[PDB]
Write an enzyme that holds these catalytic residues in place. Structure first.
Site, PDB file in Angstrom:
ATOM      1  N   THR A   1      13.014  43.980  67.121  1.00 46.13           N
ATOM      2  CA  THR A   1      13.597  42.767  66.476  1.00 46.13           C
ATOM      3  C   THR A   1      14.756  42.229  67.301  1.00 46.13           C
ATOM      4  OG1 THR A   1      13.008  43.493  64.224  1.00 46.13           O
ATOM      5  CG2 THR A   1      14.754  41.821  64.421  1.00 46.13           C
ATOM      6  N   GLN A   2      14.731  40.929  67.575  1.00 42.34           N
ATOM      7  CA  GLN A   2      15.840  40.261  68.242  1.00 42.34           C
ATOM      8  C   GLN A   2      16.029  38.881  67.632  1.00 42.34           C
ATOM      9  OE1 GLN A   2      12.788  39.885  69.129  1.00 42.34           O
ATOM     10  NE2 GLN A   2      12.368  40.330  71.294  1.00 42.34           N
TER      11      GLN A   2
END
Ligand code: BO2
Lengths: 233, 212, 222, 240, 235, 244, 204, 231, 195
Positions: A1-2
């Protein structure tokens, strides 16, 4: 996740009688800051395919390297690398689609929306979409981000269904695309005036146009607009 | 969901409803909540539709492998413990199961084990499991005896499900009856609640609250 | 935070006849309030006279169909080109779905075909792999609109015979392929009217002993 | 890890390491098993080359695997401990999962499976041990007596012997044991077991160990004096 | 010394060829396939009269529709049977159906060549795998430690195999009844066995579509032995 | 490849013997003799150091007798380095048992654990076995005073009196002759020393060539004391028993 | 919820003229519920004494761990461990669980057998050493103990005088803490004699 | 001699004897032929039985709709290699939506076999394969050897007495290459080619095994009464 | 589960454990035995999270029975209690800890003394004359503090135990459906069938 940092906005495209057209502006935004003004977001693969990419630019540059490597790999031990066993649009797409869905499945996505435009060996028009979730779909017209909301309605007036494709010339098709890019410049706050356009025709091949600008803009009527209701001066 | 099972003179009665729901939406009225593990073992289904189906058909594969290896029918105790030990490995992961493993062997006689996704394994004479379990318990506890005929026992199970089908919103559809003897289980039909309710009301004099 | 799931809308419908079986689905593909495609095929011929559709999150749907098609191929290789029966296909799909129990395929799966006695067969799945053979099943967005209509007009539910007043039910007479297609078309016409994610086109796949035929019908594009 | 294939075939179709493991069993002290009508007896030889031994603490030849099953052996002593430990662990594991103690056939099948595994696994040699496993299945009064060997084959026996000079005591048992009428009592069964060992043992003093197993977890080891009385009675009948 | 997976100059794997020699020392097993069923029979060969012969298990059930007989180092067969049973049950779990006899045999044969420096040597046992399925009917397979399997109308393995095979060459036809096949296995077993054939040192079994795989009782086989003796004395 | 150089340490001979175990025992037969004698009121451990020097620091030296815990000790015969590996493992096993059950480890359980480790090196791993034989002298509240021995095969046995290392055949005969069951520690001390004095390959038995230890209940009231004898204390007990 | 104050308890240590003293309460509880009045928190390994406050399961575990280690030390070294050396061993052992620590407050006390010098030391739950000349405190009533010690303490107190000072420091500090009390023990430690005294105190 | 103990050892003349011994296993195997025109590609294989009661061992294996092979030598090694091809063909389809090129399929088989010839512990494969297939560059025929060497050919044969069929194809080269749009005549030429390798035995109905692939023809295998037409 | 008590008298240890099993809204069973015999002279009662309780108890039972067979000897209650404590102390820092509290009642045949050990899920061990887990102690300890004398008979212990159960049945909200009582002494373990 970013989270996406440096981002690219809409990519738009459509089919016409003898091929496909695709376009995207040359901006790399950093939030509301219009940071980078010379970013190419259309990336050709051979002389029969153009991959348009929106979203995170660092991930775009990664994808660009994957495609460059794909060409190198296909040429290995391949005497027909520039003929029967050249890379097809369908091959390039299916590869990207596989990667996108795998990356989402590891909860570490390439934060992009991608359109692969091209022409196949048998002359057939190829146009298909894929994004960070691995979702795919095809349509006579395809667009990403704001293009989906503003460009598609305009392009669908030219080609509404499949039977409208043979009736649509390259001149009419390009005219529609260029207009859509103007509309996006009026209305998208993360767009730029400068853009690139690419045509892939079954007869005349791949035409890649750089440094295009939105022109014939209507602004004169702005002089007459005063205040926000009651103000006269 | 309402599922029950009870020990008596003639063996075991197993009775279940047929309803499956997703929120307030009735997804299916024709669900098979009794799993035929073999000609001698039955399993009931309550909670997660998939968890129960998957792991109870899986249980049947483990039981078949036991009797291929040991040349002998698996005990109800051993069969139930295979399932409970399995779900205990998954404890915390979010499996959702409430099951009765019912069978009849020489060494044990009629036996019922309550097996549950929190790892609980309980032997007992009567069990009711599901959202409508309290309704079914009322009818069972007041009418249950060891000396019931196969005919009367079958009806009590049928009637206990009907009671819960009426009151519990997440139970209904139809009633599946099974009777478990030492030579195996015996299916006793699908009974639509729409037809069964009016039939029982008329013949039994019950449900005077409802108009018909 | 990254959300690995999405909703592509759409609706599907499987009906089983006496010696045939249909599996229908609309061709519209969406996200939020936008149309992605007016024609994006959703029902697929998987071989061995088996049709399949996995409705919901399209990326998981395409993945599942792709893996089942692959399972059919390897079934032939491993078992001397044996025809994969509809009941066997259904059980295999359960394990595909349950294999991802703790990170599910976000789809409602329906398959259709003929059983080993030649009679029409439809199987229905939930996202984590539970299944059940059925005579009738609608799946997806407008499933709540269509199913009740199919309880009434296919299984003659709450219908009785005139003159008897609730005593005698309407007999469960069999429906021809022409009769079923009429009910499918009306089901989708009605669903399109009242559900915003349904429209554009209807594609029906019919399965008989002779093979797999296709029919396409236009739906309202608003 | 050490992966070397030690147990392998030879041109004539023999696995020499397994066959040489049997030679280790041939060297071991004699062990005998006899099952009566309602009992099984395990007899074992103690070589009297070792005196000044402490018999309280010295490892006994017969080992309890569970309360209802026993295991004796012939061959390498150190190897036998490894099989006994594994068997004891599996016995408790079986009770834990199946909620029932092992059958004698099951426990034998497990031990035999371990022995077999060591004949086609890399980096390991076979066990130089043959076992006699005896007891009574749960809630069963039929006597059980099984044998295993390094190769991993196992089988049931009305009576059997293993170890050094086992050929002689098997000869004795084959003429003295009647299948139609086995030793009806504990006395008769122990007597026949002591008799069979007296064909080989030497002195009947501290050289013979006897262990009687009866149904329902009733296992007891006879003392020196108790066995000595059998030795006395046998020879007094023989003087005729 | 030398590699376990080494080829000989003739192009054969040393260890595989040596395992075949171990199988020649094993007790005889015979199988006959008919349109009415498949019969499996074995020589028990007890080493001593004190050994309880009924504990000798050389015929084994894999599933209801598949049986198996063995010959050679019979201890090696236990993990093969365990794999076969698991494969048969696992397939039923994945596909809600019986597994094809050929597919089962192929799965067993996949273990064969998994040896090197995986297990340390090939299996020292051959298997006769008999069964029925809807597609190819009654079938009999011979599974070797080379990884190869042949289908057979009839087949004998073990010490008296080539003598038995020559007898099966003359006796087998396509119209054999199940009863005729039972007697034929007994006849040929009696011929190649060292000791005199009876119900205690020999064992029969069959697989039919209706009743599935059954191991014959010692009482049932005894009658078939008596029936055999009388029909041979009849001419 | 590497197979060419493999000695194959864990195989049977045609006679069914373990080559490496047999050869390890041959090594041990040249090591200094160690004797253990068990009495009713204690246990004696005596052992001969191998051909020493006048320049060896004896009072800080230890090659034979080692302390496993407060209740158990061992006499070594073989490779000292191999023995120390096993000794440290045994010391840890005792402490693991004490931590788990809050009770001192029973002697046999400790002995079985070390013997099982030795066994493993004869069946798998392709390594050489430990060239060590132990005499275990220990006490617990179940069996009281106990003597055991273990050898490279991993086989162990219990004893009233026992010797390991050099000249065991001669030593065992002498012990078998003079040992009695009602014997006491003071008498067992005398027997151990007299037996070494006759079996020794040296010209005379002196204090500087010995290691000695007793395990007595000769500790103030119901408890057990380990005494590792000092050089001067070995010299005194040699004069007392009439050897020097 | 807070592991260090589920069970409760205190330990205090002090130095004197050629002597040291260490003391602790006897309470073990489950928050408000009093469970045991015989839970001693002072242990010894040879002449080195160790008090441990905090979560009771870790108190027991660490005692068993240091008994384990000091027993191996003695076998290899052929001598008893000294207070200075043991202090370092405690620190090493606690810090190895840096990111999954034992919830304890150890205190060391003892006289070096060679120099004769009195020695005390304290630690946090993760290994930091506090080596005070005067006194060390630990537990749920550590604030209270700091106040008592800082006022009552004077240097070079004789063994019998030091007993009175440390006892009054513990007792009065425990009485102002809900999770401490239920009995107390004091250890007076000289070079070659150690007296242990149980104190009469209020049982609420 | 001293250098044939394992595959990791060159001989003094630079030979790998274990590889050569694997090559020998192919020569013991039953004959199989492969040939092709511009439109189609054919495999003909003589199956071998154990005795009159036994079945005839299958020689041909399908790898994909457009590709397959015939085997000669150790059948289990063909199963391993064909299974590897099946996966590689399948990887190309799933990931790239691309039918795997026959030439590239040969390159993969070469590299898989090679690893077994340079490492200690393992062994070379003991089987030879004839791979036919129709891809984007038309019909193809490949010959695989377990040394790693793969060769593209118009026609060939491997196994016992394969030299007779190989000579016939060398004469008929100009004729059978021209057989376009006529599957039956191309098979006739393959059946007549394998006939030049027969001795004592002739082609019967359960002896012969034929396989074909082409322009509008999926990879299919013919056995039993389906090949009586060509006898 | 709910209530488990223990009391050590002159010559025995008495354990009392409730019979109810409740899953949420309903009482599924009213005759559940919340105890396992570890050895002939050692009994362990237990209470905690569903599943974990029985899984842990049977696991301990299996381990002690294994020790008994291996050594042909019964471990002392103290030794068994230390083993159990260590298993729980190991468990508390695991991925998913055992949520189980136990009482261990044994008779030491060597010392001829009854012994009662209270251990919680953290691995907190204490030897006690009387003990309890959960909210049981809150009602019962005041009575035991008053009446207990260390030299009571087994009959006097059962009477003092009845007084504890009566108080619980008066003041506790939950219906625990009575208790199963077991006695541990020199002759082994037996169940009081009328209570
Ligand atoms: B029953 O209500 O427990 C029933 C038993 C199941 C085996 C058919 N469960 C369900 O209906 C559950 C929802 C539920 C309702 C009430 C209590 C507990 C659970 N439904 C599902 O699991 C489900 C899953 N996918 C689609 C539809 N329903």
């Amino acid at each position: 996740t970013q989270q996406p940092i440096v981002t690219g906005t809409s990519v738009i495209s459509m089919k016409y009688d003898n091929g496909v057209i695709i376009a995207a502006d040359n901006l790399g935004s950093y939030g509301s800051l219009l940071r980078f003004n010379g970013v190419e977001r259309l990336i050709p693969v051979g002389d029969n395919t153009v991959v348009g990419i929106s979203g995170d630019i660092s991930d775009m540059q990664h994808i660009e390297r994957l495609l460059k490597d794909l060409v190198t790999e296909n040429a290995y031990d391949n005497p027909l690398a520039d003929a029967e066993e050249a890379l097809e649009p369908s091959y390039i797409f299916e590869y990207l689609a596989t990667v996108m869905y795998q990356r989402r499945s590891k909860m570490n996505p390439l934060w992009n929306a991608i359109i692969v435009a091209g022409v196949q060996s048998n002359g057939d028009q190829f146009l298909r979409y894929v994004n960070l979730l691995g979702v795919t779909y095809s349509s006579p017209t395809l667009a990403t981000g704001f293009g989906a909301h503003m460009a598609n309605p305009l392009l669908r007036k030219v080609v509404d269904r499949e039977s409208d494709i043979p009736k649509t010339t390259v001149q009419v098709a390009e005219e529609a695309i260029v207009n859509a890019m103007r509309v996006l410049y009026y209305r998208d706050a993360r767009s730029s005036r400068n853009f690139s356009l690419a045509i892939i025709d079954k007869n005349t091949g791949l035409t890649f146009k750089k440094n295009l600008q939105v022109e014939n803009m209507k602004w004169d009527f702005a002089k007459d607009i005063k205040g926000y209701g009651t103000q006269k001066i | 969901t309402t599922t029950l099972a009870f020990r008596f003179q003639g063996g075991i009665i197993v009775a279940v409803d047929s309803r499956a729901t997703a929120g307030n939406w009735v997804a299916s009225q024709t669900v098979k909540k009794v799993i035929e593990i073999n000609p001698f073992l039955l399993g009931t289904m309550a909670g997660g539709v998939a968890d129960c189906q998957f792991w109870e058909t899986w249980l049947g594969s483990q039981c078949r492998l036991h009797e291929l290896r040991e040349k002998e029918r698996i005990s109800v105790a051993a069969a139930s413990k295979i399932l409970s030990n399995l779900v205990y490995q998954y404890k915390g992961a979010g499996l959702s199961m409430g099951t009765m493993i019912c069978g009849y062997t020489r060494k044990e006689g009629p036996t019922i084990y309550y097996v549950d996704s929190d790892g609980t394994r309980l032997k007992g004479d009567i069990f009711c499991v599901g959202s409508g379990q309290t309704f079914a318990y009322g009818v069972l506890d007041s009418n249950y005896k060891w000396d019931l005929s196969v005919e009367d026992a079958l009806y009590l199970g049928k009637r206990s499900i009907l009671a819960a089908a009426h009151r519990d919103a997440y139970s209904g559809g139809s009633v599946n009856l099974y009777h478990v003897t030492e030579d195996g289980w015996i299916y006793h039909g699908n009974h639509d609640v729409g037809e069964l309710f009016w039939k029982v009301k008329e013949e039994e004099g019950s449900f005077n609250n409802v108009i018909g | 935070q990254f959300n690995p799931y999405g909703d592509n809308g759409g609706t599907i419908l499987g009906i089983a006849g006496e010696d045939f079986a249909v599996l229908a689905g609309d061709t519209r593909n969406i996200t939020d309030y936008s149309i992605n495609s007016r024609y994006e095929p959703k029902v697929f011929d998987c071989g061995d006279n088996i049709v399949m559709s996995a409705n919901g999150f399209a990326a998981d749907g395409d993945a599942l169909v792709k893996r089942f098609k692959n399972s059919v191929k390897w079934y032939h290789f491993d078992h001397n080109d044996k025809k994969l029966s509809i009941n066997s296909a259904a059980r295999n799909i359960q394990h595909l779905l349950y294999g991802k129990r703790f990170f599910p395929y976000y789809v409602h799966t329906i398959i259709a075909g003929l059983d080993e006695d030649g009679k029409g067969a439809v199987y229905s799945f939930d996202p984590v792999g539970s299944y059940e053979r059925e005579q009738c099943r609608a799946g997806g967005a407008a499933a709540s609109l269509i199913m009740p209509f199919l309880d009434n007009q296919v299984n003659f539910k709450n219908q009785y015979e005139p003159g008897t007043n609730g005593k005698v039910k309407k007999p469960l007479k069999y429906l021809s392929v022409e009769e079923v297609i009429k009910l499918v078309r009306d089901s989708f016409t009605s669903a399109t009217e009242r559900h915003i994610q349904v429209g554009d086109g209807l594609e029906i796949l019919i399965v008989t002993k002779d093979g797999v035929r296709k029919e396409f019908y236009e739906l309202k594009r608003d | 890890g050490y992966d070397r294939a030690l147990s392998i075939f030879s041109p004539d179709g023999h696995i020499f390491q397994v066959e040489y493991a049997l030679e280790a069993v041939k060297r071991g002290t004699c062990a005998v098993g006899v099952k009566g009508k309602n009992c099984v007896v395990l007899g074992c030889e103690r070589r009297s080359t070792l005196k000044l031994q402490d018999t309280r603490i010295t490892p006994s030849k017969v080992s309890k695997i569970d309360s209802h099953v026993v295991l004796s052996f012939s061959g390498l002593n150190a190897d036998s401990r490894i099989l006994i430990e594994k068997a004891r662990v599996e016995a408790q594991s079986h009770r834990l999962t199946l909620e029932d103690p092992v059958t004698v056939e099951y426990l034998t099948r497990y031990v035999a499976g371990v022995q077999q595994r060591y004949t086609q696994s890399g980096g390991v040699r076979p066990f130089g041990v043959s076992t006699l496993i005896a007891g009574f299945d749960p809630r069963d009064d039929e006597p059980k007596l099984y044998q295993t060997e390094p190769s991993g084959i196992y089988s049931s026996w009305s009576a059997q012997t293993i170890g050094r000079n086992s050929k002689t005591v098997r000869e004795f048992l084959e003429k003295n044991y009647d299948r139609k009428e086995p030793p009806a009592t504990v006395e008769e069964c122990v007597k026949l077991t002591v008799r069979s060992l007296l064909e080989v043992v030497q002195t009947g003093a501290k050289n013979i160990e006897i262990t009687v197993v009866k149904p329902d977890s009733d296992i007891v080891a006879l003392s020196s004096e108790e066995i000595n009385q059998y030795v006395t009675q046998i020879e007094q009948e023989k003087q005729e | 010394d030398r590699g376990v997976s080494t080829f000989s100059p003739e192009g054969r794997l040393f260890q595989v060829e040596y395992s075949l020699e171990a199988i020649k020392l094993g007790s005889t097993a015979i199988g006959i396939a008919t349109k009415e069923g498949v019969v499996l029979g074995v020589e028990k060969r007890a080493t001593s009269p004190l050994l309880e012969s009924d504990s000798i298990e050389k015929i084994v059930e894999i599933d209801r529709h598949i049986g198996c007989a063995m010959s050679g180092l019979t201890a090696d067969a236990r993990s093969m049977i365990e794999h076969a049973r698991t494969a048969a049950v696992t397939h039923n779990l994945y596909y809600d159906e019986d597994i094809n006899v050929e597919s089962l045999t192929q799965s067993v044969c996949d273990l064969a060549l998994r040896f090197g420096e995986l297990m340390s040597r090939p299996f020292g046992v051959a298997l006769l795998i008999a069964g029925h399925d809807a597609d190819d009917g009654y079938q009999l397979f011979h599974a070797e430690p080379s990884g190869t399997f042949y289908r057979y109308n009839a087949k004998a393995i073990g010490s008296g195999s080539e003598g038995a095979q020559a007898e099966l060459l003359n006796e087998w036809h396509s119209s054999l009844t199940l009863k005729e096949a039972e007697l034929l296995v007994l006849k040929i077993l009696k011929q190649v066995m060292e000791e005199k054939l009876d119900e205690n040192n020999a064992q029969l079994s069959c697989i039919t579509k209706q009743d599935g795989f059954k191991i014959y009782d010692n009482e049932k086989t005894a009658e078939l032995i008596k029936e055999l003796k009388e029909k041979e004395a009849a001419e | 490849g590497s197979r060419r150089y493999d000695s194959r340490t864990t195989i049977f001979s045609p006679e069914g013997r373990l080559y490496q175990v047999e050869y390890a025992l041959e090594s041990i037969s040249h090591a200094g003799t160690a004797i253990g004698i068990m009495a009713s009121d204690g246990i004696v451990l005596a052992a001969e150091r191998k051909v020493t020097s006048t320049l060896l620091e004896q009072d800080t030296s230890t090659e034979k007798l080692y302390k496993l815990n407060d209740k158990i000790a061992v006499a070594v015969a073989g490779l000292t380095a191999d023995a120390e590996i096993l000794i440290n493992t045994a010391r840890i096993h005792a402490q693991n048992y004490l931590k788990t059950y809050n009770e001192d480890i029973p002697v046999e359980i400790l002995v079985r654990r070390l013997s099982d480790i030795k066994q493993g090196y004869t069946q798998h791993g392709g390594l050489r076995p430990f060239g060590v034989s132990f005499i275990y002298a220990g006490y617990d509240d179940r069996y009281g005073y106990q003597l055991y021995t273990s050898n490279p095969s991993g086989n162990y046995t219990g004893w009233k009196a026992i010797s390991v290392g050099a000249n065991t055949s001669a030593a065992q005969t002498l012990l078998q002759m003079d040992y009695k069951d009602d014997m006491k520690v003071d008498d067992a001390i005398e027997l151990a020393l007299k037996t070494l004095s006759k079996t020794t390959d040296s010209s005379a038995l002196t204090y500087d060539r010995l290691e000695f230890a007793t395990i007595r209940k000769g500790a103030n009231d119901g408890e057990v004391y380990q005494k590792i004898f000092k050089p001067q204390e070995i010299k005194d007990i040699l004069v007392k028993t009439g050897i020097t | 919820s807070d592991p260090s104050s589920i069970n409760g308890g205190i330990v205090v240590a002090m130095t004197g003229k050629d002597c040291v003293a260490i003391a602790c309460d006897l309470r073990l509880g489950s928050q408000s519920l009093g469970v045991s009045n015989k839970f001693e928190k002072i242990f010894h390994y040879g002449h080195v004494f160790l008090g441990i406050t905090g979560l009771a399961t870790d108190v027991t575990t660490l005692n068993e761990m240091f008994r384990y280690k000091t027993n191996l030390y003695k076998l290899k070294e052929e001598r008893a461990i000294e207070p200075e050396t043991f202090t370092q061993l405690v620190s090493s052992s606690l810090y190895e669980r840096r990111f999954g620590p034992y919830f304890v407050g150890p205190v060391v006390a003892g006289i070096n057998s060679k120099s004769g010098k009195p020695f005390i030391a304290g630690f946090d739950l993760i290994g930091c050493i506090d080596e005070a000349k005067d006194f060390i405190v630990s537990g749920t009533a550590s604030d209270q103990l700091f106040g008592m010690c800082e006022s009552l303490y004077e240097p070079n107190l004789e063994p019998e005088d030091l007993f009175e000072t440390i006892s009054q420091a513990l007792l009065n500090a425990a009485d102002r803490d809900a999770l401490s009390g239920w009995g107390a023990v004091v250890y007076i430690i000289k070079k070659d004699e150690v007296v242990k005294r149980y104190l009469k105190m209020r049982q609420d | 001699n001293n250098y044939d103990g394992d595959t990791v050892t060159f001989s003094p003349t630079g030979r790998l004897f274990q590889v050569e011994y694997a090559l020998e296993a192919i020569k013991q195997g039953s004959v199989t032929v492969g040939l092709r025109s511009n439109t189609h590609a054919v495999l003909v294989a003589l199956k071998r039985n154990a005795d009159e009661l036994s079945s005839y061992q299958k020689k041909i294996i399908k790898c994909d709709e457009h590709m397959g092979l015939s085997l000669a030598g150790l059948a289990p090694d063909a199963r391993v290699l064909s299974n590897y091809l099946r996966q590689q063909c399948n990887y190309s389809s799933l990931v790239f939506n691309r039918k795997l090129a026959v030439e590239r399929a040969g390159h993969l088989l070469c590299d898989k076999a090679q690893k077994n010839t340079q490492s200690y512990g393992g062994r070379p494969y003991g089987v030879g394969l004839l791979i036919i297939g129709y891809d984007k560059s038309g019909a193809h025929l490949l010959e695989f050897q377990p040394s790693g060497n793969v060769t593209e050919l118009y026609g060939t044969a491997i196994g016992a007495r394969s030299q007779g069929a190989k000579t016939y194809l060398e004469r008929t080269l100009d004729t059978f290459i021209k057989i376009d749009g006529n599957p039956d005549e191309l098979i006739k030429a393959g059946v007549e080619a394998i006939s030049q390798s027969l001795r004592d035995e002739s082609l019967t109905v359960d002896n012969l095994s034929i396989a074909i692939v082409g322009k509008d023809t999926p990879f299919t295998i013919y056995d039993g009464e389906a090949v009586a037409k060509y006898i | 589960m709910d209530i488990i008590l223990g009391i050590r008298v002159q010559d025995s240890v008495i354990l009392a454990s409730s019979k109810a099993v409740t899953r949420g809204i309903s009482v599924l069973k009213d005759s559940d035995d919340k105890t396992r015999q570890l050895s002939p002279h050692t009994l362990m009662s237990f209470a905690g999270e569903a599943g974990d309780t029985v899984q842990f108890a049977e696991y301990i039972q299996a381990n002690i029975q294994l020790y008994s067979i291996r050594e042909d000897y019964e471990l002392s209650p103290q030794a068994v209690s230390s083993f159990v404590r260590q298993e729980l102390a190991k468990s508390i820092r695991s991925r998913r800890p055992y949520q189980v509290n136990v009482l261990i009642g044994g008779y030491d045949k060597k010392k001829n003394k009854p012994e009662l050990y209270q251990i919680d899920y953290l691995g907190t061990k204490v030897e006690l004359p009387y003990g309890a887990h959960g909210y049981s102690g809150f009602y019962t300890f005041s009575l035991l503090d008053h009446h207990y004398r260390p030299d009571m008979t087994t009959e006097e212990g059962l009477d003092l135990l009845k007084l504890c159960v009566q108080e619980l049945e008066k003041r506790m909200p939950m219906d625990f459906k009575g208790v199963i009582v077991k006695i541990v002494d020199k002759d082994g373990i037996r169940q009081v069938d009328d209570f």
